[PDB]
Symmetry: C2
Subunit: 90 residues, 2 copies
């Protein structure tokens, strides 16, 4: 899945737009978040994204998971959200 | 759905056991969270729960959404996670 990295300052609506575009084009995307606020921003973005892909006959499902990631040569534990799209009607 | 309301002070590991128990028995559960910390605890709880049901060749899928909830005499926008059991895949 291509990866969208989210931070404490990321804006849910702009991230939601990106998620929506990746789901519409590739059918899946992953969001990586580290820290409380970033996780909150990511979840909000995913909920908003559902509203953008619905008119395109799509909804999404998410699977959260803990993952160890490298950042600034440091190893950090983060939360990753694997997101998949599927048609609402076929 | 049965509902679990997570607090900023909830222990992810305990909530995860509640989630796993419900998914195994009913195959679905809803988790509600109001503030950023509670949202973080919920996401961590859902991620740990995946490990609790994986043995049984079962995984889960989540769909987050905004929802208006009543807390005493106040209406509050919260986040809810609809969680459904999904028998595992390869
Ligand atoms: Zn550092
Ligand atoms: Zn109040
Ligand atoms: Zn009202």
């Amino acid at each position: 899945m291509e990866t969208l990295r989210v931070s404490s300052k990321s804006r849910p609506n702009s991230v939601a737009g990106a998620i929506a575009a990746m789901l519409r084009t590739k059918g899946e995307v992953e969001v990586q978040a580290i820290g409380p606020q970033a996780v909150n921003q990511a979840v909000k973005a995913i909920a908003i994204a559902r509203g953008y892909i619905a008119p395109d006959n799509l909804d999404l499902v998410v699977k959260p998971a803990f993952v160890k990631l490298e950042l600034e040569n440091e190893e950090r534990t983060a939360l990753k959200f694997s997101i998949k799209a599927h048609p609402l009607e076929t």
